Ligand binder design. Structure first.
Ligand SMILES: Nc1ncnc2c1ncn2[C@@H]1O[C@H](COP(=O)(O)O)[C@@H](O)[C@H]1O
Ligand SMILES: Nc1ncnc2c1ncn2[C@@H]1O[C@H](COP(=O)(O)O)[C@@H](O)[C@H]1O
Ligand SMILES: [Cl-]
Lengths: 317, 309
């Protein structure tokens, strides 16, 4: 019956125990928990993100946007001096329900002032070991991953070389006509690399190409890559971490470029001036990470979809 | 500058300690924590509530409503066997920001199978004493509060009698609306001064989620807690009968120049399947934290209120 929960009672008890462990993990490291809004008068500019919008009575209401990630408010807190902070929030992305996506989901996001990407990866690995009781993670660069799995260099290979690889994977249909080099790299990573990682233990992939920087600063030593990592385990994308952007002008260029592209494609998005204002005042150098709690719980239970770990997925909420 | 949080660093650190204290309270009592949706294909019919609505792409699109409280999903869990459970969630009500309101706010809602209203009140009192280091609560009925502060009986006074009383307070054709004005203006400023005040047995018309008292049909098994001028919690002996719940929703819609809301069948269906006898309570965590901090507004304990979020 559609009235019943999506997840079993035993799975929801284990869910609460994991949430408690996560909280003990950060308590033990002196990391403060914060709560930030689920709604903003501003939204994100990323072309790949689709925000929920709702009207607030505010005689003239205010448009509000549900938060795809608590990043901007947490950076505002950091700029104001909160120190190392974590949050376990409900996040909202207007995406269809899938085995591994729900339009509302639990995010674990945290920030560590004065931590570089490597020190943060190590902390994420310790958390995985604790919750999953899994082995210590392996780490490799995006480059190394391609070289080991596909015998190509993704930082230097031309599109012909790229389609040669795609052909070997039985992917020529999609690859032959695709003329965007980075898009071909994503096809190859998804189809040629992802199936061969995260098997025995979690796998960190870091130094994604500059085009796939997302929230990451570009690597100063090699502008071809970004200070971003992603963790994979048993075929599941669990987390993305970054050496965060502290430069206001650089951040603003990102948003403006985003809205310029959206126009070329999508509505232009109300920029978070509050975030740019925080960066102008001064955000401590930091690395931050966003982890999918529902996926973590799914893996900890050996469950096969989010419907097993979320009380009511959107189809019956 | 607008970029800065509403709440100070010290207040947020104290807020987190309180969150963890609430969790310790329930852990010590073996109550399970759950998480239920912030969004639903269904909504509420309650005449006092204004939800947010937002459009979902779907598996074409679907209208979603944000949750005003986790009640309906927690009842579904209860009907499925979850046992005593609490939740600390963000709840959503489409109403302007005020000193004591934000359109998104933290709710502590919990449910106790086999607790009556009195046993639940006692448990609320214990939590308040823990968080606030306040004195044990006093309790009185809606009737007693009107008798002690206004010298009238709200259960039997006629409208003339009521207007006379409103006249004496230096202040409408509905008797219940009259009672509401009297309570807000004549009773509320005069309770919760030195310790939390539990008001119980609200009139039948103000039943909200509560069963009617079987022993006196003029009143409901509902209580409200007030402290230092502020409304902190609402608790009920819960409705378990599907037929009665549905008639209440039908009536809700009748009373609604407000839009008519659909009745949530999943809730009714859970009630049909069987909801254990239980009492539940909804508490305003931000309000509670504000009182713990001796602060004046929610802007002092919420990292970013809506005006700057
Ligand atoms: N719709 C969704 N449902 C469940 N988990 C998600 C969803 N979107 C993102 N995630 C998780 O959140 C993490 C952070 O995503 P991002 O903020 O896009 O880097 C991802 O690695 C996923 O584990
Ligand atoms: N907009 C709001 N902002 C902050 N607290 C609220 C808001 N609406 C309701 N509350 C709190 O939530 C409690 C339970 O709500 P209710 O069940 O509607 O009485 C109330 O007693 C208030 O403490
Ligand atoms: Cl107890």
């Amino acid at each position: 019956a559609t009235w019943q929960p999506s997840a079993s009672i035993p799975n929801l008890l284990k869910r609460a125990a994991i949430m408690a462990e996560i909280r003990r993990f950060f308590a033990d490291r002196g990391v403060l928990e914060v709560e930030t809004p689920c709604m903003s008068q501003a939204t994100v500019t990323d072309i790949h993100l689709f925000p929920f919008e709702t009207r607030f009575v505010g005689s003239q209401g205010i448009n509000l946007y549900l938060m795809t990630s608590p990043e901007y408010h947490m950076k505002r807190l950091l700029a104001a001096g909160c120190g190392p902070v974590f949050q376990l929030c409900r996040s909202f992305r207007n995406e269809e329900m899938g085995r591994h996506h729900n339009p509302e989901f639990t995010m674990l996001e945290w920030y560590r002032p004065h931590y570089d990407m490597y020190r943060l990866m190590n902390e994420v690995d310790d958390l995985l070991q604790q919750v999953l009781d899994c082995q210590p993670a392996e780490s490799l660069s995006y480059q190394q991953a391609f070289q080991r799995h596909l015998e190509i260099d993704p930082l230097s290979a031309d599109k012909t070389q790229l389609r040669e690889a795609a052909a070997k994977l039985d992917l020529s249909n999609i690859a032959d006509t695709e003329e965007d080099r980075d898009t071909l790299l994503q096809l190859l990573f998804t189809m040629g690399v992802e199936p061969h990682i995260g098997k025995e233990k979690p796998t960190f992939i870091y130094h994604f190409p500059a085009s796939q920087a997302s929230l990451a600063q570009i690597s100063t030593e090699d502008h071809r890559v970004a200070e971003r990592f992603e963790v994979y385990y048993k075929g599941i994308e669990l987390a993305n971490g970054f050496h965060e952007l502290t430069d206001a002008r650089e951040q603003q260029q990102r948003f403006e470029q985003d809205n310029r592209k959206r126009a070329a494609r999508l509505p232009q998005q109300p920029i978070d001036q509050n975030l740019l204002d925080a960066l102008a005042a001064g955000l401590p150098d930091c690395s931050g990470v966003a982890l999918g709690v529902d996926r973590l719980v799914m893996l900890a239970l050996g469950a096969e979809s989010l419907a097993d770990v979320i009380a009511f997925t959107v189809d019956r909420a």
